Amino acid sequence: PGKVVKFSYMWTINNFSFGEVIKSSTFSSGANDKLKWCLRVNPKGLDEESKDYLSLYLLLVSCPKSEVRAKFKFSILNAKGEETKAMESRAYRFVQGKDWGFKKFIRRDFLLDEANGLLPDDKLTLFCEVSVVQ
Amino acid sequence: ASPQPSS
Numbered sequence: 001p002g003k004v005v006k007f008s009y010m011w012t013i014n015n016f017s018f019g020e021v022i023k024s025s026t027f028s029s030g031a032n033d034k035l036k037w038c039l040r041v042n043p044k045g046l047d048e049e050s051k052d053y054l055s056l057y058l059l060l061v062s063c064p065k066s067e068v069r070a071k072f073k074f075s076i077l078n079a080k081g082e083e084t085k086a087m088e089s090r091a092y093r094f095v096q097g098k099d100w101g102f103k104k105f106i107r108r109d110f111l112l113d114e115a116n117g118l119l120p121d122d123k124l125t126l127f128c129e130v131s132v133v134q
Numbered sequence: 135a136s137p138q139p140s141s
Contacts, residue, residue: 046140057140072137089137100137 004029008129010077011039016124017112019046026061029132036062039128040099043108050103054111057101058128060094068094069134074105075127079120083127091133 011024024039042055058072073088085106092100111118118124 040140042140055140087135092137099140101140102135102137103140104135
């Protein structure tokens with residue numbers, strides 16, 4: 001079977017301003033949709049170090065064998081549709097149930113300032129691009 | 135600033 005080896009996932013969280021986690025829908029890649037992924041966001045930070053930030057992680061929900069190696073990039077789509085505030089990974093080794101990401105992905109006060117155009121209509125749109133190399 | 139797991 002063929003494999004989806006690169007994929008880009010777009011997720012809009014409504015009423016954003018409203019260590020606790022929001023998890024995205026699960027999305028599939030690989031052969032026969034056998035790699036399953038989701039995004040995890042901590043809107044108020046992972047911990048004390050990151051209180052002032054949103055934290056963002058890519059989680060390998062399911063895989064058929066031992067491990068998956070993948071490179072990834074996260075960004076925000078602004079009120080115009082443009083990518084902004086990107087952070088990118090080398091390939092990292094994921095195992096099922098494990099994640100990789102940025103505990104200090106973006107500052108909350110920047111995100112919540114309407115001047116920046118990152119929460120049009122109080123919606124946060126995240127964009128994750130993944131390239132699976134093994 | 136490098137990726138880390140959440141747990």
